[PDB]
Each structure stands twice: as C-alpha cells, then as structure tokens.
Design a protein around this ligand. Structure first.
Ligand code: CZU
Ligand code: CA
Length: 424
DNA sequence: ATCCTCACACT
DNA sequence: AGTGTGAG
C-alpha cells in the first residue's frame, strides 16, 4: 500500500486580498503594497502583502506603521468597515469567482477563502484514454516544477531541465502508472490555472501529488504563480530535511511533542519507529497517521464541499477598549447580530438552507484562551434584534458584577455563530 | 493590540 | 453540549 491511488491538487491564490485590490485599482499593480484593517491603532493591521513588499520584510500581522519602517514606499489598500468591523465581502465574492471556475474541471473542496483541494483522479483517467498513448509535451506544462529534479551528471532554465528529465523517463504506455497520472493531473491544473487567470485576472500557485498533505506542501515549494508536482518517489529526499512543523497539522503542540519526545527534527526521521511505538507516544489515531504520513501516505478524502458549514461573526476589543457597560455589550452584540442576519439571509437564498442553532461566546479580560465560554440557544428567525437579545440572555449571567448597568469582568471578545443547517 | 473565519477531536 | 487544537 504505497498511497498512490489518487491524484490530488491544492490550489492557493497568491497574496489573495492584494490581488483583489490590485485588479480593482490599477495604480497598485506591480508595486509593494499591502491590505490593512483598522487604521487607527498603529496604522492598521496588515492582512495581506504583495511579493514586492515581502522583499522588504513586510509580513502579515505587522502594524502598517511598522511595515512603513521596512518599506517606506509601501502602498496600502484598506478593507471595508461596516458596523465597526472589517467586512470581507469583496474578497468572499472574488473567491466565489475562482471556485466556480475550478468546479468546471473537478469537484472541489473549499479549504479557506483562497484555497481549494481538487480530486483529479477521474479527470486524469478520462484524459489518459483521450491521449491514445502519445507523449506529454513540455509545452503542456509551462509553469510546472518537478520536485527533486534536475539531478545527476537561471531559475527558468532549471525548471525546464527538471521537467525534461521527468518527461524523458515517463512510461506513457502504462495507463495505471502513478507518475503518469500525476503528470496528466499537472496538465489539467495548468489548464485550470490558465482559466482562472483569463477569467478573473488572478494568479495562483498549486501543488499536485497523491494526497492533500503532499499537495499542500508541494504548492508552497515554488510560489508565486507556479505549480509543483511531488511524486511518491520524491518523498524520501524531500522529507529527509523537512522540518516536522511544515506538514499540515504538525505546526502546533502535537508537532512540538513529536520533536521533543522522539528527539528528531525532520519528517523522514519518523520512518525508523514502528507504528505501535508512535501510537504509544501520540495515541492510536495520531500514531497511525504519523506512521503512514512520513512514508508519504495519507487518506483524508477531498470532500465534495464547496461552501462552509458554520457562519460566525466575532469582534475583539483589546486593551482599554474592552467592553465594561451593559449597553456597550448590547450594542456590539447587536452589530454582530446584524451582519450575521445579513450573511444568513444571503445563505438562505443562494444556498437553500436554514441555520437552526445560535452559539454565543465571550472572552473576559484576564483569561488566557481564545474563548472563555460557549453557550448555545435556538436560532429560528433571521432577525438581528432577537438574536442579539437571545445572545445577551445566554451570557447575562456571566456578569459577576452586582450592578445591573455595569459589566465585570470586562469583555475582550464577543462571538455569534449560526450552526446546524437544514435544507431549504 | 493580530484579528477574524472555519473545521474537527475529545469528553 | 462545552473545550481545546490547528489552519488560512
Ligand atoms: O493568521 C491569520 N489570521 C487571520 N486570517 C488569516 C490568517 N492567516 C491567513 N489568514 C486568512 O487567509 C487568507 C489567505 O491567507 P494565505 O496564508 O494564503 O496568504 P496570502 O494569500 O495573502 O499569501 P500567499 O498565499 O501568497 O502566502 C488571508 O488573506 C486571510 O484572509
Ligand atoms: Ca494564498
């Protein structure tokens, strides 16, 4: 069982919010620029950065004021604000443009506002029978890198050398060769990426491999505006120096414990342990997953799911902006409930379904964790005043204050979330 | 003073 | 149901 049954791609829009703003405002094209939210505190928080600005050191989560120290000519586009909170609708609508195009080529799984997994297995099978048995020209793969090549006895020049070595050794007469299947998968992804750019103006990167984790890793290897094929055979060398934290799901505490408990640094070092050893350190499911994944094997399916499952609306109130009065809390709960009603109504029309549970969460000043508490209640009518009233009710007892008009401890986060949908 | 958005495992 | 982890 070598984990080679499927062709999976991951498509990731390059600096997506920046591209949306650069399409809209040509003055921002081909310039060091960034997208910011909330201009008042330190110039705004940077949420997306063009590759020209990344060369100066500008990164996501920097304050715009600090970004300008690294890049004085940095241009900024600011996110829309509605009811006091950053409003992402422009980027959501641009994302829909891209996913609709991807959907023409294969069933997609939306992974975020700007990435989607593609299961290409059947598309490849149909393209292979249409290809008689003729060779795949390098001209069909004008932006594809073959990871690990060239090898043996300028950037674009070597892309082609590696692609030449790959195609020169392809066994085209075998319609079940995994390497050939990946190659046809990459041809299709070239076509999909060309269609995205033609029809929206947006560029993207992509990974093509045998599963979602390798496809995601592949996609990051040659960014921006390129795609990377990671074959099963490329995995031992690729993983031999790959930090464990770079593999999807190992970027946090679990990945840190793998490194600490086992005393290793790279993904390939996991192969020396038995599956029972890994299960004894990390649990049955994590140990089995790690045993397969360090050999390049992962089975998480591309889920036929193009749109999300919950719709939620939150806002942070950091520092001295924490909410302290009952009618501050009710006002911001109303603001959140209003935009939630707006997105729920749109979701009832476009997608034909109705949310039926409302989740209310708060953060108290002094608490360490993203959420201090989560309560639910019924969601039956898409009406903001009722929802904000209901949300107040399920949290009105968290108020440790003896005063009715005061709220203590002060609130640093409010969150309203609609869940449990049914067809409509 | 990163700030949202969403998914899923565990209990 | 409520909490915690991980990611874009
Ligand atoms: O830490 C985060 N807090 C909030 N939101 C985040 C965070 N991290 C990512 N996001 C969201 O995920 C979109 C694409 O995130 P991304 O990592 O793909 O970044 P880009 O496309 O800008 O650059 P590239 O892909 O070229 O690196 C971003 O806009 C943003 O909405
Ligand atoms: Ca992206």
């Amino acid at each position: 069982a070598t984990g080679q049954d499927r062709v999976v791609a991951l498509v990731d829009m390059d600096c997506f919010f920046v591209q949306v703003e650069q399409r809209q405002n040509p003055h921002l094209r081909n310039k060091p620029c960034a997208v910011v939210q909330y201009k008042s505190w330190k110039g705004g928080g940077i949420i997306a950065v063009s590759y020209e600005a990344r060369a100066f050191g500008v990164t996501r989560s920097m304050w715009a004021d600090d970004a300008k120290k690294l890049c004085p000519d940095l241009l900024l586009a600011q996110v829309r604000e509605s009811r006091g909170k950053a409003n992402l609708t422009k980027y959501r609508e641009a994302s829909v443009e891209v996913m609709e195009i991807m959907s023409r080529f294969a069933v997609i799984e939306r992974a975020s506002i700007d990435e989607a997994y593609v299961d290409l297995t059947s598309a490849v099978q149909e393209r292979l029978q249409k290809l008689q048995g003729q060779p795949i020209s390098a001209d069909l793969l004008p932006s594809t890198y073959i990871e690990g090549l060239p090898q043996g006895p300028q950037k674009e020049g070597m892309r082609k050398q590696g692609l030449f070595q790959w195609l020169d050794s392809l066994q085209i007469d075998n319609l079940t060769s995994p390497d050939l299947q990946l190659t046809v998968g990459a041809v299709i992804v070239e076509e999909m990426r060309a269609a995205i750019e033609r029809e929206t103006g947006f560029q993207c990167s992509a990974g093509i491999s045998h599963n979602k984790v390798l496809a995601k890793l592949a996609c990051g290897l040659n960014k921006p505006n390129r795609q990377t094929l990671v074959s099963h055979g490329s995995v031992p060398q690729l993983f031999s120096q790959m930090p464990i934290r770079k593999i999807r799901s190992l970027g946090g505490k679990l990945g840190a414990s793998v490194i600490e408990i086992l005393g290793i640094e790279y993904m390939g070092e996991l192969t020396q342990f038995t599956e029972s050893q890994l299960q004894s350190h990390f649990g049955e499911k994590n140990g089995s997953w790690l045993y397969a994944m360090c050999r390049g094997i992962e089975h998480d399916p591309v889920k036929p799911r193009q749109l999300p499952k919950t719709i939620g609306c939150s806002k942070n109130f950091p520092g001295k902006t924490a909410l302290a009065t009952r009618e501050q809390v009710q006002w911001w709960l109303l603001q959140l409930a209003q935009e939630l009603e707006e997105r729920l109504t749109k979701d009832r029309n476009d997608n034909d379904r109705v949310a039926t549970q409302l989740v209310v969460s708060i953060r108290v000043q002094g608490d360490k964790r993203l959420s201090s508490l989560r309560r639910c209640c019924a969601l039956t009518r898409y009406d903001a005043h009722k929802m904000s009233h209901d949300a107040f009710t399920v949290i009105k007892n968290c108020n440790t204050s003896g005063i009715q008009t005061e709220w203590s401890p002060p609130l640093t986060m409010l969150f309203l979330c609609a869940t449990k949908f049914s067809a409509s």
